[PDB]
Design a protein around this nucleic acid. Structure first.
Ligand SMILES: Nc1nc2c(ncn2[C@@H]2O[C@H](COP(=O)(O)OP(=O)(O)OP(=O)(O)O)[C@@H](O)[C@H]2O)c(=O)[nH]1
Lengths: 642, 476, 135, 341, 62
RNA sequence: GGGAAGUCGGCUCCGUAACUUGGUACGGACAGGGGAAUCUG
RNA sequence: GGGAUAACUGGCUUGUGGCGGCCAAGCGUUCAUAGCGACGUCGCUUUUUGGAUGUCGGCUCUUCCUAUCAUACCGAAGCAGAAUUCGGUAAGCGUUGGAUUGUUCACCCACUAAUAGGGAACGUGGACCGUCGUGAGACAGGUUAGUCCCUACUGAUGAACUCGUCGCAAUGGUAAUUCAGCUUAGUACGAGAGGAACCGCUGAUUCAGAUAAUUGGUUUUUGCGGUUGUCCGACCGGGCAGUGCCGCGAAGCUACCAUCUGCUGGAUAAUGGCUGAACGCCUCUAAGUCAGAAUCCAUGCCAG
């Protein structure tokens, strides 16, 4: 049944930088943690970790967080954002509080990435006496009641379970002074928007909210505009600056030759090696696409091609994602195939080439893709397969980067790193590797079934893609008409341009032919063909630079753990059952002291939380069985142990 | 694959009757003015909305089914430009796309009008306006619907040409040899009557050569016009010559039996040769039976040899009538293109990197034949009677009667009863067709069967006689 | 062609929809989860079920992470509910098992562990060729 | 449910009615159509199947069969029917001398009280030289009647029930001139006809009975008059063979009845008809067996049937012994048989 | 599918009843009639040959 | 208790040595249990 | 604050827009020009490059209509085959979900032969008044508004016609559906890719009616065996745990959890014909008349 049962898992990456509409006896600016003045226990704990120099996303943020300003954070993964928001707690807290009530709230989207912030906290918080509890799904809802009675001061939690605790416990949420919403773009993607709203209303008006993320979708923007007070945008340096060491090339391909066009770039443009390679590899090409069904085609075709390729997509398994991003990072494979959401989750190393199998809809998505490569002064390349329907998104990419566009061989030596260069591929070698694609498609049924799935998956993606602008749409019609659209691309050399020129100067007259008589003229239908052709035949600086005003600039319903739509405020009865199961009294309010009893009644275990706790007695002894005496006392020993 | 799976496209009148009868037959049609105005409005809104969706699902069907020109091979978008004017084709489909956009706009506006209506008369007049306005939009669309119906019939009646595979292409001047050669090598329906252009469209056939499938394309013919002007018939020829990779076969009539001069035939080659520069060409001097290569004067031989001085042109001789050359002109051409294609295939895999692919590793493994190290061969137990045994021919009158023929005489697949004892071998025939005992006195007979049972039973007799003399069954 | 097995005599179906069954081939999957038994009748409140030899749609729940949380068709090869055979043998297997197979009838796995039901080997020749014990 | 069988109505009579006899033409020879029997139970067989095109071709197939105990009938009367524009109607009925006590019991309800007086004056009509009346009775049949039937009754003296009454019906004669079937029925008077003459092996018949009644836990559930068509006869047993259940590939001298007897029936010591599958009715119940109305259009008919074995093991429990000798030989000798001997 | 009361199915059945199952039922019925034969053979107003009277809602009572 | 459903489920601390009350290296331990079974001598 | 209609439809409703112009048979103030005026065509909407929905439901069941989604039959289409498309006769027989949603439809995805639409007096299980306000508003302000009988039918009985046996059959109900595999056959057809059907044969789903040999399930046979705790001082034998617990089990009942069975003649509709007038050609129709749908009416079946 599940042929797109719910929806395609990689949906779209809504991005926004209209989020700028939020706003000698002297160690002179050493740029270290001590220049910011952290705690003496905390700064040696940093030295235990190995953070000698703060990463740039820390260096901007942790100044502002101590000065108590709400910080929205643009930061790619792997930049050390996780430490960037907990070292202001180990600075803020410095001791365990005798009063009841946690003072730190950390909201994590997934279970596994919650443990990533968990492991950071004890790694950065040794020496002090802080208390941390984790509230994730799949754990018992009797253990999590008890860990609240252990009186923490940092609670890390998934918003589904934390709200379920909050409505069940009727916890006074006011004891928390600093809230962090880590990876909130992941939070809104899994459908926590309604539960984040009810959490936010219950958080106190006096709080310090930050929010660290990789991207800012438009729905996230309205959440901070209603949630965060006086937000400040912090961006990772030159994220929006495409690095000038990058050379780009855009190739005009048809829809039926897109697979063979990817085989051209790997074979003769990159000259990638075949097979497994004998810290990434030197070639190290990524492949970007649109849907998980396109991932499965592109991965499985390259296995049949013979290239070493790993693949990650949106609804990929937890363990399955680690092993493939491990293989790419240590250089055991050459190709990584991501959609966009798997890209923004996994940590991307220094990368050499980037292939765009499908053109990004927003021009800012292209920046995010080429931002993953050609960094830190090393040269890089970025190729994309443009189409006719994907052409207006390319002319919109011109207007954003402000670059010049060349069409095939309009210039003898176009500047790849500065000018957008479009054209066609080698004709001869494209028809060989699309012959191979059609040969494999006719041969193996499994790849053929993957084509039919990704054909209808693409047809949905075509319909729901954000449309291009009208001026970009109109100007796409002219360059299609223009003679440079089908000419050979500039990489392939001037020597390739001559024998292409001596042939297509004659060939273009075949394409420009207009039939004076359609074959139905060669009856009522014959009079009809004469009726169309008569109806539809062809129809016969003065401004100062200083001032010129230019038109251009410069009962609420939630989803429960059972998956059934439950009313938001539901008091089931488990705490009430909890409160005579051990017959506890009234819980503390916010402010009263902890009970040294209540911590030791419901403490933590030794630490290894095994998932297997099923204790059963063996079955009764059958006196005619083979192991009668062996079964006999082990049943009795079970009665002694109980 | 082909464009046969394009649904038939109706005229403007048949579009109107299909849409309007769908609205009447598949929805309720009875409403009385004494009913509530909320359900009077709900009745008429459903009728207007249903009409639009059937229009949109039909206008969307023709748009989706018809091929987009800028997605095909350059052979196909040029062929579909010549056959049907591509300027006229996207304005016919373009007209039907903006017609569906207006119909939803009519439907979107009139459901808003109906929602604020106040009488059954008002709702009746508002539906008739909407169904009438969609009717007069389709009736205006009459002219492009006839075009799209006619290009649909001719697209489904078009030969399947796949540019990727190995292709033999037969071209040349009209009335030389083309239809006779394609008929001689390939079973393919190609007319053979003797006038200027009998063939008006491309004809495709297929042939086999060392167990590999080859396709052959026959084309109408090209005149001496310098391709600035040609009609649609010969522009079909040069499109297949310019876009399809093929070992082309330029048939040349040495005799003037086509009525067209031999010096004109060379001038066509030198005009179209720039489209042939990459491929390999073979000029077939057809019809030597009436005029042989030694009979014409030595001046024309020199420029014929000058064609061979270009390294990509070969002289081949054949004569379709009497088939004096067609098999060896076929064996020559597909051999040269096979060794060309294998040269590219070994290059595609031995490119200047030093690493061979896994597809190359799999295919060298197939070619490798394992041979035992010692080199001895095992003894083969082929019986002597099978070497002189006569092969079975179904058209031979004197046939060995098979079990299929016995079946058809005695019934059919589900009537005939196979006799699995007629093939039994025994000591004598009447032991066959015998009921074989299975159970006797509550035990299996089969477990008690062995040869020398008679001698084994005598040991039971002798030992029983021993125990009777021993008195070991006596009561005390 | 719709994947309907032809010419089989019906037995007691012992694998309803939403039933966890073991995986017998070496494709890496360790568990399959039935969502659709094709060829089943259309009846209200009647859960579709399939016996040995019926080809079903399944989701991998246990196994190697490359093959986890994917949907493939499969053929039931063992079942635990007793069923009739035409010679009078009432018989059943120790577990419910199936093999991941393509819609044509070619299995992705290379070998089959455990026994193979007689009905599945007769209906699908590729499973019969890859079977070690046909019982 | 089905509207063809509604409303749920009890059968008006315990026996069962033929209702429709097969259409008669005189070209075939004379033959009777219906018969009774009494159901004894069910057992298993193995049949070597001879069906071309089936998966079970030429391999053993287990099959459930029923056993109906049929003692020989006795012909006692001949009723003739004339064809009126209000339907058929019985014109006259002729009986025979020496009606048995069991068939006379059917005419009575208190046999023990009533002195045996039925058909006493009719028997004097035969013997006191008023045989002119009997010949006038038969000549009226020959001249006016279009179809004739045989009044035949079964003997439950040999069938081991506790019922001493008998069961009468009309059995239609088909196939001949109305004169020819008169001499047929008159010759059958006071004579026992056997089921071997009525039906034969591998032929497909109809069974008429009343179903089981589901009383004592919306209305009458059960006890319905059902006729069920297309049941295949696998064996007619002769009773005196002493090898009734013996097949060609099982040479064990055994009768049809299982060890310990049929449950609530007893031992079948008479002719039995072994029929494919289930049959309407219960144990000890009268079963009316009837010929097919129409010529068969199936290959299930015209199919010769050969049997491998018949299950003579007990149905009072799980038994895996067919004969008493097999049970004794497997179990060895016991201490009760040692003390008795 | 074709109905059980379809005219083509009836005609196919009529050819089976005439050609295939016809003589088989005729031969079986001959053997049964021979068996019934073996069991069977094992003045007019004074002799009863002339039929007389034995021992009205159709006409109105006069 | 079971089946079904939904999920992302099942597949660091002690002692010892030099350095400044705190860190650094070495040695040991943590990061399992239960129930059901089969085959084999 | 006064006045006025007790209330709506009941040969209602459905598939083809409005406006202006041109043309226009007829009728008319006296005539086609005082003028009313259809079908078409022209101009506008409308063109030369391919989301909408308020209270409701949700399920089962009965019955009906056809405005037919499937299954049967035909007519037409570049309809080669395959798959279809449009239309007509047809209500015998069947007729889903999932994502999303306040809820539905549209669209998309999956299954299936298909998972059509409707009807059943739209089937059977506040209401003012008072008080305080008046640029707006209210009132823990009030009281008040505002429904257990008869009978049809079915089943089982039943008085009288003397009791009983075997029958006839007026009338009423009526039952079977759909798919697949083998052969035809890799065959017709086809350039290729592909690819049927009739006759014959064998299964399966649904539906209906039965049955208990065998295989599961169940144990007021309380049948056999083991076992827990109590008391009668002890044995025996008992009260005991409103039929203690644990194994196995006959019989009986059951199981879409097992097995069996489901049948043929006539007349037609759309349509295809034959002979042949009207009408000196011609025509399936007018008089005569052949074939033909899962249709109709009966047989088979149930009641009597
Ligand atoms: N003598 C001779 N005549 C030939 C030969 N081949 C073709 N022809 C002539 O050509 C006619 C066959 O048609 P072709 O000329 O081969 O067909 P075409 O070259 O496509 O030109 P069209 O006639 O337009 O079809 C025959 O009637 C012959 O008269 C040949 O080999 N020898």
């Amino acid at each position: 049944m599940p042929k797109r049962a719910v929806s395609p898992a990689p949906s779209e990456n809504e991005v926004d930088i209209a989020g700028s509409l939020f706003a000698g006896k002297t160690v002179k600016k050493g740029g270290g943690f001590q220049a910011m003045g952290l705690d003496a226990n905390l700064l040696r704990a940093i030295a235990r970790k190995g953070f000698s120099v703060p990463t740039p996303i820390q260096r901007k943020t942790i100044p502002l967080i101590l000065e108590r300003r709400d910080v929205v954070g643009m930061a790619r993964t792997g930049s050390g954002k996780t430490a960037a928001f907990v070292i202001p707690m180990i600075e803020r807290l410095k001791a365990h509080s005798a009063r009841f009530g946690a003072r730190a709230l950390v909201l994590s989207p997934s279970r596994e990435l919650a443990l990533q912030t968990l492991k950071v906290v004890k790694e950065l918080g040794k020496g002090t006496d802080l208390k941390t509890v984790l509230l994730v799904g799949g754990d018992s809802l009797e253990e999590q009641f008890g860990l609240m009675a252990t009186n923490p001061d940092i609670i890390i939690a998934t918003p589904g379970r934390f709200l379920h605790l909050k409505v069940e416990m009727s916890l006074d949420l006011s004891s928390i002074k600093y809230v962090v919403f880590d990876e909130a773009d992941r939070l809104f993607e899994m459908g926590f928007a309604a539960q984040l709203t009810e959490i936010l209303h219950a958080l106190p008006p006096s709080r310090q909210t930050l929010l660290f993320s990789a991207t800012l979708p438009s729905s996230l923007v309205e959440f901070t505009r209603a949630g965060l007070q006086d937000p400040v945008l912090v961006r990772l340096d030159a994220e929006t600056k495409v690095s000038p060491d990058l050379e780009s090339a855009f190739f005009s391909v048809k829809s039926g030759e897109k697979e063979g066009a990817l085989l051209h770039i790997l074979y003769d443009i990159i000259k990638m090696p075949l097979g497994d390679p004998p810290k990434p590899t030197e070639h190290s090409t990524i492949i970007f696409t649109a849907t998980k069904h396109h991932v499965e085609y592109i991965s499985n075709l390259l296995r049949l091609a013979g290239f070493s390729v790993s693949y990650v997509y949106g609804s990929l398994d937890q363990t399955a994602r680690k092993i493939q991003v491990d293989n790419f990072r240590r250089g055991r494979t050459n190709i990584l195939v991501v959609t966009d959401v798997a890209a923004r989750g996994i940590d991307i190393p220094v990368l050499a080439n980037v292939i765009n199998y499908d053109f990004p809809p927003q021009p800012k998505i292209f920046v995010h893709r080429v931002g993953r490569t050609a960094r830190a002064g090393q040269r890089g390349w970025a190729y994309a397969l443009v189409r006719e329907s994907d052409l207006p998104y390319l002319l919109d990419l011109q207007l954003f980067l402000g670059r010049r566009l060349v069409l095939g061989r309009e210039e003898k030596d176009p500047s790849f790193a500065r000018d957008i260069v479009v054209g066609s591929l080698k004709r001869v070698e494209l028809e060989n590797n699309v012959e191979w694609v059609n040969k494999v498609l006719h041969e193996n049924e499994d790849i053929g079934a993957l084509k039919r799935v990704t054909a209808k998956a693409e047809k949905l993606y075509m319909k729901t893609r954000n449309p291009a602008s009208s001026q970009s749409a109109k100007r796409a019609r002219e360059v299609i008409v223009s003679k440079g659209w089908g000419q050979l691309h500039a990489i392939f050399g001037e020597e390739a341009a001559n024998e292409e020129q001596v042939r297509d100067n004659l060939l273009s007259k075949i394409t420009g032919y207009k039939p004076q008589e359609t074959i139905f003229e060669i009856n009522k239908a014959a009079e009809a063909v004469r009726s169309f052709r008569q109806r539809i035949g062809p129809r016969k600086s003065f401004a100062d630079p200083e001032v010129y005003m230019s038109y251009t600039p410069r009962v609420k319903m939630i989803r429960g753990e059972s998956g059934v739509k439950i009313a938001a405020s539901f008091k089931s009865g488990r705490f009430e059952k909890w409160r005579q199961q051990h017959r506890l009294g009234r819980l503390p309010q916010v402010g009263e002291m902890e009970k040294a009893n209540l911590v030791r009644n419901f403490s933590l275990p030794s630490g290894p939380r095994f998932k297997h706790k099923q204790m059963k007695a063996p079955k009764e002894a059958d006196k005619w069985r083979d192991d009668y005496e062996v079964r006999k006392k082990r049943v009795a020993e079970a009665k002694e142990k109980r | 694959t082909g464009w046969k799976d394009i649904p038939p496209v109706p005229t403007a009148q048949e579009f109107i009757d299909i849409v309007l009868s769908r609205t009447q037959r598949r929805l309720p049609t009875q409403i009385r003015p004494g009913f509530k105005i909320s359900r009077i409005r709900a009745f008429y809104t459903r009728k207007v909305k249903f009409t639009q969706e059937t229009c949109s699902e039909k206008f969307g069907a023709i748009i989706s089914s018809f091929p987009v020109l800028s997605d095909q091979h350059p052979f196909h978008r040029d062929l579909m430009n010549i056959l049907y004017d591509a300027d006229h084709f996207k304005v016919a489909l373009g007209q039907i796309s903006t017609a569906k956009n207006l119909i939803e706009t009519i439907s979107r506006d009139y459901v808003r009008l109906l929602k604020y209506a106040q009488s059954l008369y008002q709702c009746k007049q508002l539906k008739r306006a909407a169904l009438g306005r969609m009717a007069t939009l389709i009736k205006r669309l009459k002219d492009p619907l006839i075009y799209l119906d006619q290009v649909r019939q001719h697209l489904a009646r078009l030969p399947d040409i796949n540019p990727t595979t190995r292709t033999l292409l037969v071209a040349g001047f009209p009335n030389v040899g083309k239809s006779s050669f394609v008929r001689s090598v390939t079973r393919a329906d190609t007319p053979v009557e003797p006038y200027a252009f009998t063939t008006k469209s491309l004809f495709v056939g297929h042939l086999d050569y060392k167990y590999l499938r080859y396709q052959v394309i026959d084309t109408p013919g090209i005149l001496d016009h310098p391709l600035e002007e040609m009609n649609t018939i010969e522009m079909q020829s040069v499109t297949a010559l310019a876009h399809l990779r093929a070992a082309v076969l330029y048939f040349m009539d040495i005799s003037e039996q086509c009525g067209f001069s031999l010096k004109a035939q060379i001038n066509l080659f030198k005009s179209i040769k720039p489209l042939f520069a990459n491929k390999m060409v073979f000029i077939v001097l057809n019809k030597m039976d009436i005029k042989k290569f030694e009979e014409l004067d030595p001046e024309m031989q020199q420029e014929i040899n000058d064609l061979t001085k270009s390294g990509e042109v070969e002289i081949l001789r054949a004569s379709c009538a009497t088939q004096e050359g067609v098999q060896e002109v076929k064996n020559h051409v597909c051999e040269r293109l096979l060794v060309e294609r294998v040269s590219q295939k070994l290059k595609a895999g031995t490119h200047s990197n030093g690493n061979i692919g896994t597809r190359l590793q799999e295919v060298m493994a197939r070619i490798h034949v394992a041979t035992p190290m010692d080199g001895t061969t095992r003894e083969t137990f082929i019986p002597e009677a099978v070497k002189n045994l006569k092969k079975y021919d179904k058209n031979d009158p004197n046939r060995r009667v098979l079990a299929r023929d016995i079946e058809e005489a005695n019934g059919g697949a589900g009537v005939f009863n196979v006799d699995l004892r007629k093939d039994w071998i025994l000591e004598n025939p009447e032991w066959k067709y015998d009921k074989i005992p299975e159970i006797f006195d509550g035990k299996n007979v089969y477990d008690y069967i062995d040869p020398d049972i008679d001698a084994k039973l005598q040991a039971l007799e002798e030992e029983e006689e021993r125990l009777e003399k021993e008195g070991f069954y006596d009561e005390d | 062609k719709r994947g309907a097995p032809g010419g089989k005599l019906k037995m007691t179906l012992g694998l309803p929809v939403g039933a966890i069954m073991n995986c017998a081939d070496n494709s890496g999957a360790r568990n399959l989860y039935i969502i659709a038994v094709k060829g089943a009748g259309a009846r209200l409140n009647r859960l579709p079920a399939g016996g040995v030899g019926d080809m079903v749609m399944a989701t991998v729940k246990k196994g190697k992470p490359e093959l986890r949380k994917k949907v493939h068709p499969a053929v039931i090869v063992r079942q635990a509910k007793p069923w009739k055979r035409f010679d009078g043998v009432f018989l059943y297997f120790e577990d419910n098992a199936g093999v991941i197979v393509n819609p044509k009838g070619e299995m992705k796995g290379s070998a089959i562990t455990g026994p193979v039901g007689k009905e599945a080997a007769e209906l699908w020749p590729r499973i019969a060729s890859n079977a070690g014990v046909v019982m | 449910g089905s509207l063809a069988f509604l409303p749920r109505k009890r059968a008006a009579r315990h026996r069962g009615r033929v209702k429709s006899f097969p259409k008669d033409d005189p070209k075939k020879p004379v033959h009777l159509t219906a018969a009774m029997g009494y159901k004894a139970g069910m057992t298993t067989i193995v049949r070597d199947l001879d069906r071309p095109g089936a998966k079970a071709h030429k391999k053993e197939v287990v099959e459930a069969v029923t056993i109906i105990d049929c003692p020989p009938m006795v012909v006692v009367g001949l009723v003739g029917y004339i064809e009126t524009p209000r339907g058929l109607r019985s014109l006259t009925t002729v009986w025979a001398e020496h009606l048995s006590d069991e068939v006379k019991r059917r005419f009575y309800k208190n046999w023990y009280k009533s002195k045996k007086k039925a058909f006493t004056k009719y028997a004097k009509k035969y013997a006191e030289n008023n045989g002119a009346s009997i010949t006038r009775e038969l000549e009226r049949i020959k001249k006016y009647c279009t179809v004739v039937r045989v009044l035949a009754h079964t003997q439950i003296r040999k069938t081991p029930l506790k019922q001493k009454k008998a069961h009468l019906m009309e059995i239609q004669i088909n196939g001949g001139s109305v004169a020819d079937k008169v001499e047929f029925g008159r010759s059958l008077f006071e004579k026992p006809v056997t089921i071997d003459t009525i039906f034969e092996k591998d032929e497909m018949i109809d069974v008429i009975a009343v179903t089981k009644g589901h009383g004592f836990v919306a209305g009458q559930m059960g006890y319905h008059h059902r006729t069920s068509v297309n049941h295949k006869i696998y064996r007619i047993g002769k009773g005196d063979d002493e090898a009734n259940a013996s097949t060609e590939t099982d040479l064990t001298k055994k009768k049809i009845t299982p060890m310990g007897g049929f449950v609530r029936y007893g031992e079948v010591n008479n002719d039995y008809v072994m029929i494919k599958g289930s049959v309407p009715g219960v144990k000890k119940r009268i079963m009316t067996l009837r010929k097919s109305l129409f010529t068969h259009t199936s290959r299930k008919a015209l199919e010769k049937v050969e049997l491998k074995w018949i299950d003579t093991s007990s149905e009072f429990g799980h038994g895996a012994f067919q004969t008493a000798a097999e049970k004794k030989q497997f179990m060895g000798t016991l201490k009760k048989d040692l003390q008795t001997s | 599918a074709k109905s059980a009361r379809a005219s083509r199915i009836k005609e196919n059945h009529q050819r089976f009843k005439k050609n295939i199952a016809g003589p088989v039922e005729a031969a079986r019925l001959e053997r049964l009639s021979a068996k019934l034969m073996a069991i069977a053979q094992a003045s007019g107003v004074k002799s009863g040959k002339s039929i007389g009277r034995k021992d009205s809602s159709i006409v109105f009572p006069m």
